[PDB]
Curated annotation (Swiss-Prot):
Localization annotation: Secreted
Entry binding sites for heme: 58
CDD domains attached to this UniProt entry: lipocalin_NP2 (cd19453)
Known partners and oligomeric status: Interacts with human and rat coagulation factor IX (F9) (inactive and activated) in the presence of Ca(2+).
Keywords noted in UniProt: Blood coagulation cascade inhibiting toxin, Disulfide bond, Heme, Hemostasis impairing toxin, Iron, Metal-binding, Platelet aggregation inhibiting toxin, Secreted, Signal, Toxin, Vasoactive, Vasodilator
Keyword Transcription carried by entry: no
Classification via InterPro entries: Calycin, Nitrophorin, Nitrophorin_domain
Something else known: Demonstrates antithrombotic activity in rat models of thrombosis.
Known tissue expression: Salivary gland (at protein level).
GO molecular function: histamine binding; metal ion binding; nitric oxide binding; toxin activity
Origin organism lineage: Eukaryota, Metazoa, Ecdysozoa, Arthropoda, Hexapoda
Organism whose genome encodes this protein: Rhodnius prolixus (Triatomid bug)
Protein name: Nitrophorin-2
Presence of keyword Transcription: no
Length: 180
């Protein structure tokens, strides 16, 4: 299901609150009703002199499999957003497959504070949208998002009641992969 094109980042957001620690997805919204598998995800995003690089993990809770990626792209000047190319790696961060140059994801930060964040991700394989997802993020696994971030969900035109909560899925994480 094609990504929403009604996305732009929150202006004036504090990038130091976003590029910090690791994030766990506590709640995700993929509106596509053809989806069946539910995921857990965690990642650790960094930024140095305009270049964003992040280590990313997905766990397919239905199939009990996982995959790892490294994303890299430029920080937009117009707001807290980046379009990254991604490599596939193993749990030891060894490269399995270099980036396919036709593929990218755009991550747009909608809110970020010291405990929590809200972001939108659209993954593209050339001219095909793989899909988009909104993710509520916290620094501690199974934590509660802040009131500020909950407000951002509503103000994005969304309803938290429709998100899938990950705390009850039986997630397996790889905390070593996302550690400082
Ligand atoms: C719980 C939240 C998330 C869910 C439900 C989700 C879901 C998915 C799904 C279903 C796929 C396709 C898997 C496949 O068929 O191979 C995928 C791939 C991908 N996702 Fe996510 N995702 C989540 C969070 C994220 C986050 C936070 C990021 C970036 C920071 C991200 C970036 C990507 C990328 C780059 C791919 C392509 C990976 C590859 O082909 O190697 N996703 N995701």
């Amino acid at each position: 299901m094609d990504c929403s094109t009604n996305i732009s980042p929150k202006q004036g957001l504090d990038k130091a609150k976003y590029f910090s620690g690791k994030w766990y997805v506590t709640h995700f919204l993929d509106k596509d009703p053809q989806v069946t598998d539910q995921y857990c995800s965690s990642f650790t995003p960094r930024e140095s002199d305009g270049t964003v690089k992040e280590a990313l993990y997905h766990y397919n809770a239905n199939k009990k499999t996982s995959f790892y990626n490294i994303g890299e792209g430029k920080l937009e000047s117009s707001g807290l957003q980046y379009t990254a190319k991604y490599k596939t790696v193993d749990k030891k961060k060894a490269v399995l497959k270099e980036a396919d140059e036709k593929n990218s994801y755009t991550l747009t930060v909608l809110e970020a504070d010291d405990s929590s964040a809200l972001v939108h991700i659209c993954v593209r394989e050339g001219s095909k949208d793989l899909g988009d997802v909104y993710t509520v993020l916290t620094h501690q696994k199974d934590a509660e998002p802040s009131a500020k971030v909950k407000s951002a969900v509503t103000q994005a035109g969304l309803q938290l009641s429709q998100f899938v909560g990950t705390k009850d899925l039986g997630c397996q994480y790889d905390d070593q992969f996302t550690s400082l």
